[PDB]
Amino acid sequence: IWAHEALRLFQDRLVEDEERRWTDENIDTVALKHFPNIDREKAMSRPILYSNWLSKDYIPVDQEELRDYVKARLKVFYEEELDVPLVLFNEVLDHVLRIDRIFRQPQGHLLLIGVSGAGKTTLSRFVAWMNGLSVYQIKVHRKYTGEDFDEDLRTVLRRSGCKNEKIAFIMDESNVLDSGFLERMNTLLANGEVPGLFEGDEYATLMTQCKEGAQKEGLMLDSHEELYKWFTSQVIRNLHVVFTMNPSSEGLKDRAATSPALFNRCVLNWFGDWSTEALYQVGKEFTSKMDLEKPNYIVPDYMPVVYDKLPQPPSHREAIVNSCVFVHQTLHQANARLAKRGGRTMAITPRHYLDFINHYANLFHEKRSELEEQQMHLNVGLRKIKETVDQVEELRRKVNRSTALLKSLSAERERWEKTSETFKNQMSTIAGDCLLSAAFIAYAGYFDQQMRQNLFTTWSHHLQQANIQFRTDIARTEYLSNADERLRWQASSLPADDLCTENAIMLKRFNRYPLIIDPSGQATEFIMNEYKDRKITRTSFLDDAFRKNLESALRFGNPLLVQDVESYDPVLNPVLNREVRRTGGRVLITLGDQDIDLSPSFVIFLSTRDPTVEFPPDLCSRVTFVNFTVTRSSLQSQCLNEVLKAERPDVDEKRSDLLKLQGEFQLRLRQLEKSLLQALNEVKGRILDDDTIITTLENLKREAAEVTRKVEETDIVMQEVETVSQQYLPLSTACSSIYFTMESLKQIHFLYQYSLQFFLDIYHNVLYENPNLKGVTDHTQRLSIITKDLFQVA
C-alpha cells in the first residue's frame, strides 16, 4: 500500500520517462533500506494496482482480472451511452484506476494533461458513468459568452448543491474562451462556491431550492447564511471538475499564474502521448484479426529496435507491428526536422495511429479478397482452355474455327501464365504493400511531395532492414486506384498529376472527415462534381444558416461541403468524433443540447483557401488533412499545354483529341478483356456450343482491330506531336522556376505574398497580350520573344 500511494503521489505528475524510472527505482531502494528482511516479490512486484470494483474493499487486483472486468463494463457502456469502441492496454488500466481514485474523494478535481485524441475525455466519461456521476460539458459555439458560461455554472451548481446529484464537470483548454471563465473556475475549485454568481431574484430562488434540499435531508435550516453554508458543503460533496490540456510548455506556467487553483486543488495526471509500449499493444491487438502469419519468415541479423520488449524470436506479426510503431514514430522526427528548417508542422495524435491501423486492416482485407477472385477466375479460365485444347486434339485424330481461336488463345495462355506467376508474388508481398499504402494514406496527407517521398523512402528502408516483403519498383497511385475511378475523377475536372490522384484517393478512403487545403478552388469544385448526384450542399461557418443546413444534412443523409474552416464551430466536435448512441434501434447524435437521429449516408468535408494557417490540435486530431499543393511537374505540364495552345493551336487541338481517344481505347480493351474472361468462366461449352463460340471469336477480332488502331495512333501521331512539344519544354522549365522563386520570396519579407493566380496572370499576359509579338509569324522568333517577355514581365 505504501508503494502504491508513493507511486500515485510522486510519479503521476512526472513528465519524462527517465524521471518515472528514477522514482520506480528509488521506491524500492528506500523500502529495502528501511526494511531489510521484507520479501520484495510479495510487496514490490511491478504491476502495483489497487481497486475496489471487483469486491467491497480497496484491495489489490490483477491486470488480467481487471482487464476482463473493464471489458465487460465497456460492453455495457457502449449500449448505455457511447458506441465508440476502445482498445485496452496497460496504460488505460492504470489511468482508469487513477481517475476513479480521484473521483471517490468529496472535492475531487482532476487535471489530465496529455495529447489530444489520447482518450482523456472518453476515459473520464467512462469512469464517471461507472461511479454514477452525471457528466456535464459546456457547449461552446461562435457566440458563446461569459454570461452563457455563468448560466451553465449556475445550472451545474444548482444540480450539485440542491437536489444532491453527483456531477463530473468536464472542461477543456478550448472551453475557457476568456479570462473570466478561468476566474470563476479558480474560485469554484478553491472554495466550492462562487460568491456573487447568484444575484437578485436568482439568489432568492436558490435559497428556496436550498431550503427544499434540507427538507429532503431532514435538516432544519432557516437563515439565509446557514442555507448558503449547507449549499456550499453539498457542492463540495457532489461536484467533480475534470480538466484536459495539451502538454505544451509556456502554457502550464501561464496557467500556474492565471488560475493557481489548478495546481493546489486539482490532482495532476500527466498522460502525455501513447508510449512505444502503448503503440505496440494497440497495434498487435487491432491487427490480430488480420492474417499476418508467415511460416517461412527469415529474421535478419541486425534488426532495428523500436519496442524494447520485442520477443527475441520476432514472428511475422511482431515484425509487422514493430514496423507500424516505427511508422508512427517517424512522423515526429519529420515534424522536428521540418520545424527546425522552416516550420508549419502539425500534431501527430494517437487518432492518427488508429486511422493508420484501421486503414491497414481494411486495405489488407480488400486487396486479399480481390487477388483471390482474380486468381480463381484465371485458374478456371486456364482449366477451360486446357479442356478445349485436349478436346480439339482428340477430335483431330469443324476444326478451322478451333485453329482461328487458338491463334489468339496461345498468347492468351502465355500471358495468363505470366500473370499467374506475377500475382503469386503479390500474395507474398501483400503485407508490406498494404502497410506502406495505409501509412502513406494516414500520415502524408498534409505534406508536400518532397516530404511524402522522404517518408515513403524511410518506411521502405525500414521494411527492407526488417526483411518484410513489399513489392518495390511500383507506384502507389496505381496500387490504390483502378483506371475506371481515375477516369471518373478526371471527368470531374481533377488535375492530372500524381499528387491530385492520391489526394482523391485520400478523399475516398477516409475515416476522419477530411479537411481540404486548396489555395485555389479546384478541390472544392472536384468534390462538388463528384457528390453532385448525392445532392451535396455548399455551406460556410460564417453563414448564420450553417446550423440549419448542418441539422438537415445530418437527419437526411446528404453530403455537406463547408469552407472558411479557420472559423471552426465546436458544434461539430461530436460529429467529427462520431459520438453516436445506438439506442431504440437508431443512431442518435447530440448537437449542443438537441439530439437528432443521424443517417448513415451523412458525409462532411471541411476546406480553406489559406495554406499558411495553423490549426489548434483539438481540430488537428479530428480531421484528415488533404493538402492540394502545386508541384514542379504539374506546373511544367500546365505551362506546356498553355504554350502549345497559344503558339501552335492546331497541334494542341490534335493532341487533345488524340489523348482523349487513347484513353477510350484502353478502357474498351479492358472491357473486352473482362467480357472474354467472364464468358470463358460462365459458359459450359468448350467447342460444341456455337452460341458461345460466336461471341468469342468476334471478341478477338475487336481486340486485334483496336490494338492495331491504338498502336497506329499512339506511335505515328504522338511522335510528331512530341517533337513539336519538345522545343517548348525549356520555356516550361524556366516558367516553373520563376514561380517557385516567387513562392520562396515570402521567406525574406513577410509582405512578399504571391499566389499562383498572380503568376498565371503574368504568363497569360505574356502569351495573349504581348505587343512585341505583333507581326512575327516564325515560331522560333515568337518563342524567343515569349521567353524574354516572360522574364521581363515577371
* Residue corresponding to grid cell 467533480: 240
Beta carbon of residue 509, minimum distance to ligand ADP (angstroms, whole number): 18
- Tell which one of 11, 52, 90, 122 touches ligand ADP (CB under 6 A): 122
CB of 351 to ligand ADP, least distance (A): 6
Grid cell in block for residue 576: 467529427
What DSSP character marks residue 346?
-
Q: Could you tell me which stretch among 113-121, 206-214, 291-299, 519-527 binds ligand ADP (CB under 6 A)?
A: 113-121
* Nearest CB to ligand ADP, comparing residues 92 and 640: 92
Known binding residue 116? Answer is yes
Residue with cell 477451360: 384
The CA distance from 561 to 492, in Å, is 16
- Nearest distance, CB of residue 245 and ligand ADP, angstroms: 10
Residue nearest to ligand ADP (CB): 119
**CB under 6 A: which stretch of 115-123, 296-304, 651-659, 704-712 binds ligand ADP?**
115-123
- Measured CA to CA in angstroms, residue 72 lies from 54, 65, 88 at distances of 12, 11, 12
d(Cα 775, Cα 792) in Å, to the nearest integer? 20
How many residues at the interface with ligand ADP, by CB under 6 A?
Answer: 16
95 touches ligand ADP by CB under 6 A: no
Q: Which of 284, 278, 374 is nearest to 323 (CA)?
A: 284
Site string for ligand ADP, 573-612 (x = CB under 6 A): ----xx----------------------------------
User: CA geometry: angle at 137 spanning 131 and 141, to 5°?
Assistant: 170
Q: Applying CB under 6 A, does 92 fall inside the site for ligand ADP?
A: yes
By the rule CB under 6 A, 406 interacts with ligand ADP: no
Instruction: Closer to ligand ADP by CB, 63 or 264: give it.
Output: 63
| Minimum CB–partner distance for residue 577 and ligand ADP (Å) | 5
**Based on CB atoms, which residue is closest to ligand ADP, 294 or 578?**
578
| x/- track of binding to ligand ADP for residues 226-245 (CB under 6 A) | ------------------x-
* Residue 208 among known ligand-binding residues: no
Residue 96 binding ligand ADP, by CB under 6 A: no
The answer to whether 328 touches 356, Cβ cutoff 8 Å, is yes
Residue 103's nearest CA partner among 231, 230, 266 is: 266
Q: Exposed e or buried b for every residue in 621-640, given b needs 16+ CB within 10 A? A: bbbbbbbbbbbeebbbbbbb
Taking the least distance from each CB to ligand ADP, the nearer of 318 and 618 is 618
- For the residues of 529-595, what is the DSSP string, one character each? HHTTTTT-EEEESSSTTHHHHHHHHHHHT--EEEE-GGG--GGGHHHHHT--EEETTEEEEEETTEE
Q: Least distance from C-beta 513 to ligand ADP, angstroms?
A: 12
Q: Measured from the CB of residue 98, what is the shortest distance to ligand ADP in angstroms?
A: 14
Nearest of 281, 255, 224 to residue 86 by alpha carbon = 281
> Is 205 annotated in some ligand binding site?
no
What is the residue type of 92?
V
Tell me which stretch binds ligand ADP (CB under 6 A): 82-90, 257-265, 510-518, 558-566: 82-90
For the segment 243-262, give every residue that binds ligand ADP (CB under 6 A).
244
Q: Per the structure block, which three cell numbers stand in for 458? A: 524511410
The HSE-up count of residue 550 (CA atoms within 13 Å, CB side) is 24
In 397-429, alpha helices (H)? 400-428
Considering beta carbons, is residue 367 or 512 the nearer one to ligand ADP? 512
Pick the binder of ligand ADP from 86, 261, 361, 587 (CB under 6 A). Answer: 86
> Is 180 marked as a binding-site residue?
no
Q: Which is nearer to ligand ADP, 358 or 426 (CB)?
A: 358
Between 131 and 692, name the residue whose CB sits nearer to ligand ADP. Answer: 131
Nearer to ligand ADP, 290 or 742 (CB): 290
- Residue 118 annotated in ligand binding: yes
Strand ranges of the sheet holding 240-245, from the earlier edge strand across to the other edge: 134-137, 167-172, 240-245, 109-114, 266-272
Question: Of 84, 207, 679, 785, which lies in the binding site for ligand ADP, with binding defined by CB under 6 A?
Answer: 84
Is 553 labelled as part of a ligand binding site?
no
Cβ-based neighbours of 745, under 8 Å, separated by 6 or more: 752, 754
Task: Give the burial class of 479: count Cβ atoms within 10 A of its Cβ; 0-12 exposed, 13-18 middle, 19 or more buried.
Answer: middle
Please identify which residue in 99, 118, 138, 735 interacts with ligand ADP, judged by CB under 6 A.
118
User: Any binding-site annotation on 685?
Assistant: no
Q: Which stretch binds ligand ADP (CB under 6 A): 81-89, 187-195, 199-207, 732-740?
A: 81-89
Closest separation between CB of residue 60 and ligand ADP, Å? 24
Tell me phi and psi for residue 611, to 5 degrees: -85, 0
Q: Name the residue nearer to ligand ADP (CB basis): 76 or 545.
A: 76
Q: Does 117 bind ligand ADP (CB under 6 A)?
A: yes
**How far is it, in rounded angstroms, from Cα 312 to Cα 309?**
9
Nearest approach in angstroms of CB 354 to ligand ADP is 6
Measured distance CA(249)–CA(479) in Å, rounded: 42
Q: Which regions of 592-731 does DSSP assign to beta strands (E)?
A: 594-597, 604-608, 624-627
The interaxial angle of helices 632-647 and 718-725, nearest 10 deg, is 100
Calpha distance 581→588 (Å, rounded): 5
Query: Between residues 622 and 648, which has the closer beta carbon with respect to ligand ADP?
Result: 622
Region of 564 (left: φ > 0; alpha: ψ -120 to 50; beta: rest) is: left
Stretch that binds ligand ADP, among 86-94, 382-390, 466-474, 736-744 (CB under 6 A): 86-94
* CA 552/CA 535 separation, integer angstroms: 12
Contact between 120 and ligand ADP (CB under 6 A)?
A: yes
437 is in an annotated binding site: no
Site for ligand ADP in 331-370 (CB under 6 A): 351, 354
- 121 near ligand ADP, judged by CB under 6 A: yes
Min CB(146)–ligand ADP separation in Å: 24
Residue stretches of the annotated binding site for ATP: 114-121
Which residues bind to ligand ADP, rule: CB under 6 A? 84, 86-87, 92, 116-122, 244, 351, 354, 577-578
Residue stretches of the annotated binding site: 114-121
